[PDB]
Amino acid sequence: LMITSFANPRVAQAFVDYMATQGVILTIQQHNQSDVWLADESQAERVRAELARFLENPADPRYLAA
Amino acid sequence: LMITSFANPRVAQAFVDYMATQGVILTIQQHNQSDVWLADESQAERVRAELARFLENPADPRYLAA
Numbered sequence: 001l002m003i004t005s006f007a008n009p010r011v012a013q014a015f016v017d018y019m020a021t022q023g024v025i026l027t028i029q030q031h032n033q034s035d036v037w038l039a040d041e042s043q044a045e046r047v048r049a050e051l052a053r054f055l056e057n058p059a060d061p062r063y064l065a066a
Numbered sequence: 067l068m069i070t071s072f073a074n075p076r077v078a079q080a081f082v083d084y085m086a087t088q089g090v091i092l093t094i095q096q097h098n099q100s101d102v103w104l105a106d107e108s109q110a111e112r113v114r115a116e117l118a119r120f121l122e123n124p125a126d127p128r129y130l131a132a
Contacts, residue, residue: 001110002102002104003102003104003110004101004102005099006099006100008098009100011124013100014132015116015120016102018116018120018129018132020132021132022116025105025106026102026104028101028103029100029101031099032075032098034073034074034077034094035070035071036069036072036092036093036094037067037069037092037093037094037095038092044069046088046090047069047092048069050085050088051069054080054081054084058080066086
C-alpha cells in the first residue's frame with residue numbers, strides 16, 4: 001500500500017529511516033521531473049537545436065564549464 | 067512553451083545554465099514526488115499513526131537522530 005507522498009525527498013527518507021528503527025521497512029518510489037519552460041517562443045527552434053546536441057552528451061565540457 | 071523534461075534536476079539545470087550563457091532564459095517547473103510504499107499491510111495502521119506524529123513536526127529530534 002501507498003502510505004503517502006512527500007515533495008521533499010529528504011523528508012520522505014527521514015520518515016523511512018525512522019520507521020526502519022521501529023522494524024518497519026518502507027520503500028520509496030521517487031518520481032523525478034524537471035520540466036524546462038521557455039517564455040519567448042521565437043527562441044524555441046534555437047533551444048531545441050541545442051537540446052539535441054546536449055542529449056547526445058550532457059557531460060560535454062561545454063555544459064560542465066558554463 | 068515546454069521544451070522538455072528531465073528526471074535528473076542537475077541535468078536540467080546544466081542545460082538551463084548553458085542556455086543562459088547564450089542569452090536564452092529558461093525556467094524549471096520542478097515537480098517533486100517521493101511516494102512511500104509499505105509491502106506488509108498488517109503494519110499500515112502503525113505506520114499511519116507514526117506518520118501523523120511526523121507531519122506535526124518532521125524536524126523532531128526523534129527523526130533527525132534516528
